[PDB]
Assembly symmetry: C2
Homo-oligomer: 97 residues x 2
């Protein structure tokens, strides 16, 4: 249903009822080694069926180049089923199935 793609990783198949921790800290669901990412950068969740919530913690988040603090994203917000994300200076892509 909702997949998250960072360069160099397998697609992350986002599951319900799970808090995804995103940062440069090791041992997180999404640990990215890039120096532009904060140790505790952000968190993602499935808010309800087909809808992902992203929340910025210590790091900044951009959705299609617009800064957001907290944002809910579903297929209706996508272009050709995709959304560009950026965490610090690290780009990623969400895809809705």
């Amino acid at each position: 249903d909702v997949s998250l793609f960072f360069g160099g990783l397998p697609a992350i198949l986002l599951k319900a009822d799970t808090i995804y921790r995103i940062g440069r800290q090791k041992g997180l669901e999404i640990s990215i080694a890039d120096e532009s990412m904060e140790l505790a950068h952000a968190t993602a969740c499935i808010l309800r069926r087909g809808v992902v919530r992203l929340a910025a913690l210590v790091g900044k988040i951009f959705v299609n180049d617009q800064e957001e603090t907290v944002v809910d994203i579903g297929m209706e917000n996508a272009v050709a089923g995709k959304v560009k994300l950026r965490f610090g200076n690290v780009e990623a892509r969400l895809e809705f199935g």
Copy 2:
């Protein structure tokens, strides 16, 4: 001082460490796992945003700060009375205490 602790009734205080994402929910194995029906499995997160300031973000569940609903909120000593800030996660009462 820059000590910030989270209290859920009759649980030991959780002292919040910098650069750490605290998962808050009913799911077992989280930093803050609370067995209450009104807590969602993936309810919220807390993290030290900067010295003496905690950011809380509501995920699946709702958060209330001194009874006012918030989605993302930053809380430091300026929001405390006698060192305390009242929080609610769903129907679960909690408080932040600032050193």
